[PDB]
Amino acid sequence: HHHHMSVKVFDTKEVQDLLKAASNAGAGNARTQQIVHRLLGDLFKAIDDLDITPDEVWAGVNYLNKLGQDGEAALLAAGLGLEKYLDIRMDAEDEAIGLDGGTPRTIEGPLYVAGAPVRDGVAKIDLDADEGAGPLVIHGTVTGLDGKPVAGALVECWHANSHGFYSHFDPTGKQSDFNLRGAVKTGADGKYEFRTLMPVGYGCPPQGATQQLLDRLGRHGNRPAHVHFFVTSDGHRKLTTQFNIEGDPLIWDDFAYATREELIPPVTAKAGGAALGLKADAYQDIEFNFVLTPRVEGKDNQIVERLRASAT
Amino acid sequence: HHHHMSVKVFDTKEVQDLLKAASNAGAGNARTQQIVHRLLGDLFKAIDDLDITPDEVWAGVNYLNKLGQDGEAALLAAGLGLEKYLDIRMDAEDEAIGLDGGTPRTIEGPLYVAGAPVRDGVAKIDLDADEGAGPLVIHGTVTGLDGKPVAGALVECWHANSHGFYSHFDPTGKQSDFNLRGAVKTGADGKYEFRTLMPVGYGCPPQGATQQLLDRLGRHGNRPAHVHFFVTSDGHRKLTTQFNIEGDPLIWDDFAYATREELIPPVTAKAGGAALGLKADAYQDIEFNFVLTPRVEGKDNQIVERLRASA
Ligand SMILES: CCCCCCCCCCCCCCCCCCCC(=O)O[C@H](COC(=O)CCCCCCCCCCCCCC)COP(=O)(O)OCCN
Ligand SMILES: CCCCCCCCCCCCCCCCCCCC(=O)O[C@H](COC(=O)CCCCCCCCCCCCCC)COP(=O)(O)OCCN
Ligand SMILES: [Cl-]
Ligand SMILES: [Fe+3]
């Protein structure tokens, strides 16, 4: 409660012996031992430097229990910019080898669901009534770096409803499996099209551990309205990206730091929606093309494996 | 698969800007911002230096989900030596100012339960039958640094059964509330005594997150047989300590790094348990005295507040 000087122990042989024992550095997976030794040592050193008290350490330890009970570790990874950091490093790798000329990547987020039924060329993906969102058409072409259309590319799409909730993750009810999620296989013309409704921005669960820490930091936990994409096709690297809805006031204040200048396409007002199966004549239209990068020596060294949900 | 040079982006302006934004370090709690800025920046820098891949990062992220789901964050804190590290730092504090003369501290561990009924001088704490454990008597005096008995000290004791399980945390069933957990208030002579059963060493839940990571590090998750104590007294600092059962082959291979050479008292065989209320005539006996350290200006600046179970 009263300030005192930190007593420094990190460089002592006892602490260094403890770090080597606990990480088992130098059976066991050597790479995991190496990573643990470095992260544990950095934590010990930070506790020494900032005089992080046992009360503070146990608050952090018990915070991790709540974070996992909430299922929110990946949400915090986005909120603390760790997920953006991974893109920064992948972007720097692409810049060094000259693979940075396609549509830019941005974060995947934690809300992808595998298994959407694949449609030929066009998918209508709003399965459930949403009185609060107007119809939205997203369309474009999948091309390579040379401008030619990519046949048989798989474009997957997911976004939120007018309350900012995703199917499979709705805390107010159970949406239909794959509501506002689709997948289209492009034809020879490389064209894809999604017919859906306009999303609104996401907000962290207000009593969740992510928002609790953000609240303590003085930060909001909101995202601007956006739509996610995967684009997969042989001969190209797997594209993970997004675009933001034009004009959202949170576009340059995303709590997950995912907005990119090239990922803010214009939205157009259009008519004749009924002829497209849309629920209203006037609709908003976004033209967005995906420019892919090629595999190098047949390899995609930036595809990411992580725990992902799946549905019927 | 093939080796390449790790990209270095940490010292770029974009990363430094991202770190300041994410920690908000520069509304909010300044101390939390400071700690987050440091811990998050260290993590980014570690990712650069070791070229930690996204696949690796996400495995750690999803591991954290499992760790919290299992409710094991504090178990891993002990298993990775973090809990011992906190004691190393408190011990160095005491040494610097000359408060290091008493019974040594060691780790609390995550299995304390508040509320044991305070008995006078002696508590019998084995409520549940355990055919795998013989009787154990633990007895001693609570004194200050000057050797005078401390009257009214509260000595709390908790430990495992012969399967290595604690009441309130037993995976094979439900023990009685406060089984193998006791509280004793010393009288004028400073003496305490617990009548209990002999513990067996603890092992991490085999399918839990802590053992999963220890397995990946090539480490076991076992503790020697031991007994925990709190000693709370109005004029002294609160002592958190333990002792290990003499002769346990894991005394010098504790996965939580909590063994101290001053905390391994002799065990002697005795007879006469019936008159003590023990379930058998023959029993094992441990004399263990607590030497407390005084408060400074009536304050205890080493007492630890953390989430604790109660019953
Ligand atoms: C560094 C190399 C890599 C190793 C680490 C890898 C992970 C680093 C990731 C980037 C940094 C993220 C840090 C996350 C932990 C922050 C915990 C704050 C949560 C919190 O609200 O604690 C409050 C107390 O704060 C306080 O007392 C002050 C802040 C608390 C200390 C936070 C750090 C503790 C370090 C030990 C935990 C292990 C690391 C954590 C990831 C609440 O307190 P309350 O009890 O009133 O609760 C009331 C609510 N229910
Ligand atoms: C509780 C108090 C004490 C806290 C300790 C904090 C100090 C840091 C020191 C320890 C922290 C380590 C945390 C876990 C890292 C390793 C977890 C991996 C365990 C594991 O089984 O993953 C394997 C791969 O490991 C790997 O690939 C290596 C993964 C290493 C990741 C390191 C970076 C993670 C950063 C996360 C911090 C996030 C902060 C904000 C959320 C297998 O993987 P699998 O997928 O095949 O599993 C399917 C089953 N075999
Ligand atoms: Cl129990
Ligand atoms: Fe999203």
Ligand SMILES: [Fe+3]
């Ligand atoms: Fe224990």
